[PDB]
Structures are given as structure tokens and as C-alpha cells.
């Protein structure tokens, strides 16, 4: 269609899976309370100085988070944000700041359960925010205490219980700091993944999300596409809990859009093996061809699921390559013994039969590629079942030109992609340029 | 030898460790069963609805894996693969598909132990596949239940046991999803590392591999070079177990091949400090010089161990640099206070004595580098024991030219490697080019 697939296959770019394009949007929110400190009432006789030291260390961790959150809460009034008081912010910080303000309308109800949050003695409990709303409290290490320390009070010495508690708390903080430590300069954000907030509950995000009652057909893709996120909207440094707003978006199918994967196959040119350097994921919207940074997206067999639009510009030469101008397609020399030397597409086999041994199962005859050919197309109009190494493939028919193997193409320029090679090429061209100029 | 080490050392590229080159190959395989769901018989009175919800969530995770595996199992017949039915595949997917077919010959025997797999109540058990073969079943969370929940049935309330089980299962799934979730679009693969499959057993790959009876001199290098891999060959969504084929290859020493490390040392040129931009790992095979992507390989003091051939092309100018044309070697300006200013090789010290203070321990005299010199070579024909800062080094003798310090070289062009600088340099050269053209 839009990509000139026949000429592209001739330079090792075999049409791969066509995937549809999705972006997360329109999220609904829920608030959950994470208690950052366990209830040690049932082990209290043997806690010693542990909880006192724990609370001090934890306050140091949570305090700068609370501060950054308050900065926005003290600047937004009713919903107008004090741009002067904020001074410097990105659009993302401002938007998150608005979401923060709105969230406080509910955080204020949750906070009236302060004493009911303090008293929770189970890993997960149900409190009433309002008669019509529930808020759950997830408590760090509460299960550890309830099943590992409480039953052991009269089995191990009292001092050993103290040490066991101290270590459980210290390990919790060591893991907690990666996310809730100094790295979190922007707690006023709605882009922070839920798997990163669940660290406050031991990394157990499945319990967190199940507790909230969320389960959808697209749920696992939303998780691994980093679309389910949360925002810390409130921090309590006396009771040691945080209120987290969790965003549950839906995936919007982008209309007239898809991501086309190309399967890179080495090919022959001038008695050497080459691989083409083009995007192996081309994003097409309407009739526009652009690049996509799929390294930030979840790729399934059916779709590319992104948490934002990751479309990027493409040069004119690459677009011209993709639409048929193979003289514009860069190639890198293959020096490695481990590259794709063939690919299957549409039931048709595209292979470099100079670098692999292509034998026909039906006749026992070799499939011979001439020096002038890049790849051979092997389909069942020539060989119904083909052997490549120890792999036997039953082939279909090619729906493109019957003369595919009889027509040569222009092949583009050699390039080198090593980061060092890029610097070398720039300075070399620059010296040639100075001679010319 | 092949690299012009004497001229290279003069631009800050001091010969480092010569390592031999290895690639994993010829793997032998074993099948192991991982039970994805614990046996709760001894806690069954207090499991509530937990296992029912667990199984549903787990089926959602395993179901798409089973589906992708069946796609190939339904297309391969006897070993011919239905290229038409597959439609689109890479050589790697096709090869893995063949391995999958072969694996089923044994999976079919393991599956006859279905009821014996269901009944396992220990983290590791030994079942008979055939009279002459054993298959082990590794069970997720079985130890947790056997030592943490079973002994506590009459110590904690029944409801607390239910919650403890629910959390253990939920944490397991939260960790499991990173690998066995939507990210695994290609379960039909034999390149997936064993440390990634062991997640199905809590990440405990040492138990998995010990159970299989594998232990070799090269075992730890195979693990950290990502050479020990497995393939999911069978998924059972009723009994909740997977059959994993584990590949145990051997390391093949590549003949007439080595990787030469260069130790980058800053040097003086035109009253400023420079670092050379060349590959710091040069792969040499026979007499060919190429680049190696060691970022994907395990580097030990003796060898570079790769799970495939990671050789890449090198430009003519870089190769010319490495073979003695120092006018072709790019240099980047040093603006940082933390760069290597010296290196030790062969017992000989190569140092930029303009940027460091080089003092001779034997005489108390300063070692003076002139403006025309890049580096000084300090060996024991000049100073037997030398002081660089607070480091005292007893030196050997240089086996190259005695006039090393007396002979100047051409120094190549300045470059900038910042990603922004690369874009800037390209557009700047392009405008100069348009003036010329």
C-alpha cells in the first residue's frame, strides 16, 4: 500500500506484522491510603526503640514530598493557580497541580479517618470515607508482623523479636528509597507508574489494584505500557500515611493509524553481506509516514500501546526509501555470523541464499542466487517445500510480481552506525569540505 | 602486532588487557516443570475464595502464552512447518518453532504425570517421566505455605491465614508479570534467559539449575553472559503448570580471535587536554579489525563471553587510526576534572605530566613534559620509582623505541560526541556545503 513493500523486501526489509496504534486516555480516579508504618500493638512489648528510629528516618524521607505537595496546595485557590508564587513550572507540573487541587476535595474526607487509619492492624482494611464511598488502607509490613512476629512472641526471645522487626523495617526503607527518596523531585505528577508507588506497600501492586476493584480486558496491557499511574496527593508525617490517587485510563484506538514492523534480512551486494538501516517500526497515520519510539511502548502481537504519542519526524530521504527509492536506503556491512539471513512473510520466503544453504525438499536441487541478486524470493511457484539449514518450510505463493527475482534494483550508500564511527565520519567529511571550500 | 600500539599509546590509547573471544554454542536440553500455583491442601480450611481468584488472574496471564505456543504446534507436522499458516515469522521464530516441535516429544510424556504434578506438596519433587528419565516439579510459594502458613494454623485466626495467602499470591503475580505478562509476545523463543523464567519459581534460578544437575567450570560465566536460556514449550491452564526446556550450551573458543582493550588516557595538544575517541574494545579475528558491542557481553579478566557474535563494521578511517595513522584518530576536548591522566601497561607508565604532578621517588626531581609532547613515557631507564600524586609506582622497562619521548606525531581532528553536538555539527556542515555547492 503506502510503503513500497516489494522494493523494500528486495533490500532485506520484509513486511512484518501490521499492528494497530493505541494511546491511553480519559482516566477515572480513585484514592487509596498507604500506611507507611506498621501497627506493632500485638508485638509492642518487644519493639524497643525500633519504631522511634523508624519514624524519624521515615519522616526524613516523606517530609520533602509533603513540602513539594504543599507548595501547590497553598498556591491554588477557588480553580486558579498562583503563577507568581509557583514561579517556574512546566505544563506537566501545572496540569498535575490542578489534579492535585481537585484531589484534595476527597483527601479532606479521608483525613477525617485519621484515627481509624492509625488503628488499622491488617494489611488491607476497609474504611468509610463517606456513607457512599469506601477508602482502603494498605499497610506496609502488617502481614509480616501478623504472621511472622506475633505468633513467635513466646518462641523466640523478646530481643530477637526486636531485631526481626528492625530488619523488616530497614529492608522496607532500603527498597522504598529508590522511588520515594531524593529521585522524586516532582511528586506533583500524574505520570508516575503505579508499580512505582506500590513500593510503599512492598511492590505489591496487584493487591493495591484489586482492592480498588479494577479489572479490565486491557488491564495487563495498561500495566506494562505504563498507563496506570498515581499521584501522591497528601502526606501525613504524624500518622505516617500517604493518600495516592490512582488513574485508570482506557485505550483509545487511533483511527487510520498503524505501526508497520519490518523484518531485517541480510542481502548480497558486490560480493558482501549487507543489512539495511531503516526504522524497523514505521508509524503511519492517514498517509503520513513517521518514526515511532516504540522503545517506550508495549508491543503486543496486535497493537503498539503507548502512554503518550511517541511519533517523531522522519527525514525526506528515509521517507523516499520507504516509498520505493531504494537508492536512498542506507546499508551497513555485515561482519557478524549472527544476523537474520531469511524471513517468512505471507507464506513467502525471503532469503540470502549466498549466506545460507537453500535446498528444495521436493526435488533435492539447490536454489542458486546469482551475484547480481540481493535476495531470492522462494515461493511454491518454484519450490513447494524448501529446506534452509535444518528447517523445512512449506511455502505459499507470492502475490506481487511473478518476475520478482528477475528484476534488479538500485542499492543505496554504505553507512556505519557505531557511535565512534559517527564522529569519525563527521570529521572526515568536514576535511573534504574544507578542501572543496 | 596488528594494532600500532606505539603510536596509539602516544594519543592516550594505552594497550590494555588482551582477552580471548568466546561464543556460546551446542546446547544440550532438559525439561523442568514449574507449577505456577501452590498446593494449599494443608491450609485449605482457611483459603476462602483466594485460590479461585488467583487461578482466574493466572489464567489470564498464561492463556496468551499457551495460544502463541499452540500456533506453532498446530502448524508443524511429521518436521515440516506450514509457512502459509504461520504467515509472518523471523528466522529466529522459525528456528524456535522447530525446537518447540521437538520438545513436544518429551512434553507429551511429562503431561502423563498431570495428576502427579497436581498432587505435589513440596517446593521441589522428583517425578518419573520414563523409567530412565526424571522430571522435576518446582512449585511456586510451596515453601512459604509449608513453613509460614501451615505451622500457624492454630496460632493466628483463620481469616489472617487467608489474607497471608492472598498477599503471597498477589506479590508472586506482581513480580511474575514483568516477564510472563504482555511483554512476552514471543514465547516461541530459545533466547529467553533462565534468570527470567525462574521468576515463575520466585527468581530462584540456582535451585532450578541445581535440580537439573548442571554445574560446570564455565557455569557462572554462562549465567552472566546470558547464555543459559529456556523456552516455554507447554502451558497447562487447568493444572497451572508450564514445561520449560532449558538450554545448556558450551563456550567455544574462537580461534585466531581476541578482544583488545585500550586504556584511554588524556593527553596534551595545543595547550589543552584531549581524550581520543576510538573503540576501547577492538575485536580482532585473523587480520581483520572490527568493532565489538561488548555492552551485550560478559567481560572477565581473561575473556569476552558473548551469547552470539557481536562483531560490527568499522570505518576505514578508524581502522587506519588503529593501524598507525594517528592523523585519522578523532579527539574530544577534556573539560572535566575526572579523567584518566595516566595508565600502567607492561610495567611502563604513560602519563600526562602537564595535568598531573609526576615526581621521581629516587631523585626528588620533577618529570617535565614539554608543550610539544602529548604524553610522557616513564619507565626505569629514566626513573626507577615514580610518584604520581600520592601513588608510588615501581616501574619496568619499555620494550618499544628508546626514543619514544623524543619523537612527535600527527594528531587528528577535534570532535564533539554530545548527542546535541552531533545534530549541530551536521547542520553546520550542511550550510557550508550549500555555500560551496
Amino acid at each position, epitope marked *: 500500500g503506502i510503503l513500497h513493500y516489494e522494493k523494500l523486501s528486495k533490500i532485506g526489509l520484509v513486511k512484518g506484522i501490521t499492528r494497530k496504534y493505541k494511546i491511553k486516555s480519559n482516566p477515572l*480516579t*480513585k484514592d487509596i491510603v498507604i500506611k507507611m508504618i506498621p501497627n506493632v500493638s500485638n508485638v509492642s512489648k518487644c519493639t524497643g526503640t525500633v519504631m522511634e528510629n523508624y519514624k524519624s528516618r521515615l519522616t526524613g524521607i516523606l517530609s520533602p514530598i509533603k513540602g513539594a505537595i504543599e507548595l501547590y496546595n497553598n498556591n491554588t485557590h477557588d480553580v486558579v493557580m498562583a503563577g507568581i508564587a509557583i514561579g517556574i513550572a512546566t505544563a506537566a507540573q501545572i496540569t498535575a497541580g490542578v489534579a492535585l487541587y481537585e484531589a484534595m476535595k476527597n483527601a479532606d474526607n479521608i483525613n477525617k479517618l485519621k484515627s481509624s487509619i492509625e488503628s488499622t492492624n491488617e494489611a488491607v482494611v476497609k474504611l468509610q470515607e463517606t456513607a457512599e464511598k469506601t477508602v482502603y488502607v494498605l499497610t506496609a509490613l502488617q502481614d509480616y508482623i501478623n504472621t511472622n512476629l506475633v505468633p513467635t512472641i513466646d518462641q523466640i526471645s523478646c530481643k530477637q523479636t526486636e531485631l526481626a522487626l528492625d530488619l523488616a523495617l530497614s529492608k522496607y526503607l532500603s527498597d522504598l528509597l529508590f522511588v520515594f527518596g531524593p529521585n522524586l523531585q516532582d511528586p506533583v505528577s500524574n505520570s508516575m507508574t503505579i508499580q512505582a508507588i506500590s513500593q510503599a506497600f512492598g511492590g505489591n501492586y496487584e493487591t493495591l489494584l484489586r482492592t480498588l*476493584g479494577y*479489572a479490565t*480486558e486491557d488491564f495487563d496491557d495498561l500495566l506494562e505500557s505504563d498507563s496506570i499511574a498515581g499521584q501522591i496527593v497528601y502526606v501525613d508525617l504524624s500518622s505516617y500515611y500517604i493518600i495516592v490517587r490512582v488513574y485508570f485510563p482506557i485505550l483509545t484506538e487511533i483511527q487510520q493509524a498503524y505501526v508497520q514492523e519490518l523484518l531485517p534480512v541480510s542481502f548480497n551486494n558486490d560480493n558482501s553481506e549487507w543489512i539495511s538501516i531503516v526504522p524497523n517500526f514505521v508509524l503511519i497515520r492517514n498517509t503520513l509516514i513517521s518514526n515511532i519510539e516504540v522503545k517506550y511502548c508495549l508491543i503486543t502481537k496486535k497493537s503498539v500501546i503507548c502512554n503518550q504519542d511517541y511519533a517523531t519526524p522522519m527525514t525526506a530521504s528515509v521517507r523516499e526509501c520507504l516509498t520505493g527509492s531504494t537508492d536512498k536506503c542506507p546499508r551497513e556491512l555485515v561482519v557478524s555470523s549472527h544476523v537474520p539471513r531469511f524471513a517468512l512473510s505471507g507464506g513467502v520466503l525471503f532469503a540470502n541464499c549466498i549466506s545460507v544453504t537453500c535446498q528444495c525438499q521436493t526435488t533435492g536441487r539447490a536454489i542458486s542466487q546469482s551475484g547480481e541478486q540481493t535476495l531470492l524470493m522462494i515461493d511454491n511457484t518454484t519450490c513447494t517445500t524448501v529446506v534452509l539449514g535444518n528447517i523445512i518450510i512449506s511455502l505459499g505463493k507470492y502475490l506481487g510480481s511473478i518476475n520478482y527475482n528477475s528484476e534488479s534494483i538500485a542499492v543505496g550508500p554504505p553507512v556505519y552506525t557505531d557511535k565512534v564511527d559517527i564522529s569519525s565520519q563527521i570529521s572526515s567529511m568536514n576535511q573534504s569540505l574544507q578542501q572543496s571550500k | 602486532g596488528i594494532l600500532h600500539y606505539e603510536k596509539l599509546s602516544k594519543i592516550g590509547l594505552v594497550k590494555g588487557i588482551t582477552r580471548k573471544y568466546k561464543i556460546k554454542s551446542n546446547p544440550l536440553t532438559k525439561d523442568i516443570v514449574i507449577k505456577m500455583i501452590p498446593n494449599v491442601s494443608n491450609v485449605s480450611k482457611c483459603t476462602g475464595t483466594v485460590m479461585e481468584n488467583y487461578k*482466574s488472574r493466572l489464567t489470564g496471564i498464561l492463556s496468551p502464552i499457551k495460544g502463541a505456543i499452540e500456533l506453532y504446534n498446530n502448524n508443524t507436522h511429521d518436521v515440516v512447518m506450514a509457512g502459509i499458516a504461520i504467515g509472518i515469522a523471523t528466522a529466529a521464530q522459525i528456528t524456535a518453532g522447530v525446537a518447540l516441535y521437538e520438545a513436544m516429544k518429551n512434553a507429551d510424556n511429562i503431561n502423563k504425570l498431570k495428576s502427579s504434578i497436581e498432587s505435589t506438596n513440596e517446593a521441589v519433587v522428583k517425578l518419573q517421566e520414563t523409567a530412565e528419565k526424571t522430571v522435576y516439579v518446582l512449585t511456586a510459594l510451596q515453601d512459604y505455605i509449608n513453613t509460614n502458613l501451615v505451622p500457624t494454623i492454630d496460632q493466628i485466626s483463620c481469616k489472617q491465614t487467608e489474607l497471608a495467602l492472598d498477599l503471597a499470591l498477589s506479590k508472586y503475580l506482581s513480580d511474575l508479570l514483568f516477564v510472563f505478562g504482555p511483554n512476552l509476545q514471543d514465547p516461541v523463543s530459545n533466547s529467553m534467559t533462565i534468570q527470567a523464567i525462574s521468576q515463575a519459581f520466585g527468581g530462584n534460578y540456582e535451585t532450578l539449575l541445581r535440580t537439573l544437575g548442571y554445574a560446570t567450570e564455565d557455569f557462572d560465566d554462562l549465567l552472566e553472559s546470558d547464555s543459559i536460556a529456556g523456552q516455554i514449550v507447554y502451558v497447562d491452564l487447568s493444572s497451572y503448570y508450564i514445561i520449560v526446556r532449558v538450554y545448556f550450551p558450551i563456550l567455544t573458543e574462537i580461534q585466531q580471535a581476541y578482544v583488545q582493550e585500550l586504556l584511554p588516557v588524556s593527553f596534551n595538544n595545543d595547550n589543552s587536554e584531549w581524550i581520543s575517541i576510538v573503540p576501547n574494545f577492538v575485536l580482532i579475528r585473523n587480520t581483520l579489525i572490527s568493532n565489538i558491542e561488548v555492552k551485550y557481553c560478559l567481560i572477565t579478566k581473561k575473556s569476552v563471553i558473548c551469547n552470539q557474535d557481536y562483531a560490527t563494521p568499522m570505518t576505514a578511517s578508524v581502522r587506519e587510526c588503529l593501524t598507525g595513522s594517528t592523523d585519522k584518530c578523532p579527539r574530544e576536548l577534556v573539560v572535566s576534572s575526572h579523567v584518566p591522566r595516566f595508565a600502567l601497561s607492561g610495567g611502563v607508565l604513560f602519563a600526562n605530566c602537564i595535568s598531573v604532578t609526576c615526581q621521581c621517588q629516587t631523585t626528588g626531581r620533577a618529570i617535565s613534559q614539554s608543550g610539544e609532547q602529548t604524553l610522557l613515557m616513564i619507565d626505569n631507564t629514566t626513573c626507577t620509582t615514580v610518584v604520581l600524586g600520592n601513588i608510588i609506582i615501581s616501574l619496568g622497562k619499555y620494550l618499544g623505541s628508546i626514543n619514544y619521548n623524543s619523537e612527535s606525531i600527527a594528531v587528528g581532528p577535534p570532535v564533539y560526541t554530545d548527542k546535541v553536538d552531533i545534530s549541530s555539527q551536521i547542520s553546520s556542515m550542511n550550510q557550508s556545503l550549500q555555500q560551496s555547492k
Partner: antibody, heavy 117, light 107 residues
Framework: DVQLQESGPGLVKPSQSLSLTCSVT?????????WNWIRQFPGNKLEWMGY???????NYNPSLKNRISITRDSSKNQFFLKLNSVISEDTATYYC????????????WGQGTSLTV | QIVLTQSPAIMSASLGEAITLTCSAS?????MHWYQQKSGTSPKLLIY???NLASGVPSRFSGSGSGTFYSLTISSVEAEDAADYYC?????????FGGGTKLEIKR
């Protein structure tokens, strides 16, 4: 405290375009939630038709995907169900409902507009 | 779509006795919601997320289930329970309802 009140013609001819309006009081149609349409057939069988979200995005029941459009009018705090063309089978009581995260269910329902075709 | 079925279509119970209303799904869902429709009124959420009681719902109601099988239990059935109870899933699109079961009160 949302009162969803739907209204429209109680009778349209075959091949006419149907337009039902759901007036919402007590909450802004643009600030939150998903705004749904559901219809109940004479046999009391319930069918979900689709929704428009707070930002204007749509999600429809595939069986009638090519005949349905759910839109909003923020200035009146209303949302609308439009069917490009109606068929005799489309005789049903049409309800509007609010979907949200509190229950992950449609909780507030209107009274229903009984439509004859 | 996911088809929800609720058989038998009509059930009956005496005053004061428990009755279980059931639902089966053609494909697994994680949660099931239940709605109660009394004559002359729109369906009103009864049970949400399988086991929870909605805003104005009497303690007589409860529920459970997983995967493809769910139930709505009415303890101590009374006259106000004479309604069409619907099984609803929102797990996959389109969102669907079962045909609904009518609970008759014996007199």
C-alpha cells in the same frame, strides 16, 4: 447527587434520525465520569449502547457502531444519543447512566424515555 | 461479546427463606455487578464488584464468585425483593447484561 433526566420524541418513523437528550444536574458533564446510554427492549433485555467520556471520547457497542453517535453540549450540561437511522427493532426504553470509579458500574440511571418506531 | 446467562429465568421463594440467584459467563470476567429492576423503575445497582453492597441496599443481599460463575444471594427474602435481577459485566467491550431473572414471592 446527580439527577439524570432523559427526554426525546416518544415516536419516530422508520428511517428517521433519532435524537435523545440526557440533562444532567448536580455534576458537570465535562469534569468527570463516563456518560452512558443503555436501552431496554420490550422483552426486558438490557443492552449497553455506548458512552461519551468527560473529554469527549467515544466507546460504542459494536453491533450498532455504524449507526450511533454520542455527543455533548457543555453549555447546557447535556449529552445526546443520536441514531443515524432507526429500525422497528429499535423500539425500547432508553436510559442514560453515569459510570464511575466508585463502583466501576453504572449507578445513577435516568427514568428512561420510551421510544416507539 | 461476553454472553451472560442466568438460568432459570424465573425463580420463586417464600417469605423469610434464602434464595440464590445465579449467573454464568461465556468467558471469564474478574467481577460481576448486579442490578435490581422493580416495575416502573430503571435498573438500580444492587451489588458491585461481586460482593459489595451499593448505597441503599439492604443487608439481606450478598454475593460471590469468580471467573465464569457468579451468584447473588438473598437471605431472608421479603416482599420488596419481587424484582428482575440482572447480571452485568464491564470487563470487556461491549459491556453486557444477562437476560435477568425474576424473583417471585410465594403467597
Amino acid at each position: 447527587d446527580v439527577q439524570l433526566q432523559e427526554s426525546g420524541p416518544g415516536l419516530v418513523k422508520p428511517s428517521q434520525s433519532l435524537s435523545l437528550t440526557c440533562s444532567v444536574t448536580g455534576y458537570s458533564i465535562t469534569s468527570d465520569y463516563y456518560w452512558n446510554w443503555i436501552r431496554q427492549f420490550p422483552g426486558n433485555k438490557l443492552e449497553w449502547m455506548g458512552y461519551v467520556t468527560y473529554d469527549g471520547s467515544n466507546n460504542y457497542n459494536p453491533s450498532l457502531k455504524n449507526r450511533i453517535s454520542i455527543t455533548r453540549d457543555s453549555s447546557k450540561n447535556q449529552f445526546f444519543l443520536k441514531l443515524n437511522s432507526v429500525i422497528s427493532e429499535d423500539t425500547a426504553t432508553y436510559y442514560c447512566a453515569r459510570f464511575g470509579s466508585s463502583y466501576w458500574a453504572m449507578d445513577y440511571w435516568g427514568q428512561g424515555t420510551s421510544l416507539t418506531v | 461479546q461476553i454472553v451472560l446467562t442466568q438460568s432459570p429465568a424465573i425463580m420463586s421463594a417464600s417469605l423469610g427463606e434464602a434464595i440464590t440467584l445465579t449467573c454464568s459467563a461465556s468467558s471469564s470476567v474478574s467481577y460481576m455487578h448486579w442490578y435490581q429492576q422493580k416495575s416502573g423503575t430503571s435498573p438500580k445497582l444492587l451489588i458491585y464488584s461481586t460482593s459489595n453492597l451499593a448505597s441503599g441496599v439492604p443487608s439481606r443481599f450478598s454475593g460471590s464468585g469468580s471467573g465464569t460463575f457468579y451468584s447473588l444471594t438473598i437471605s431472608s427474602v421479603e416482599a420488596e425483593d419481587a424484582a428482575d435481577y440482572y447480571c452485568h459485566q464491564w470487563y470487556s467491550y461491549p459491556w453486557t447484561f444477562g437476560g435477568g431473572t425474576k424473583l417471585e414471592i410465594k403467597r
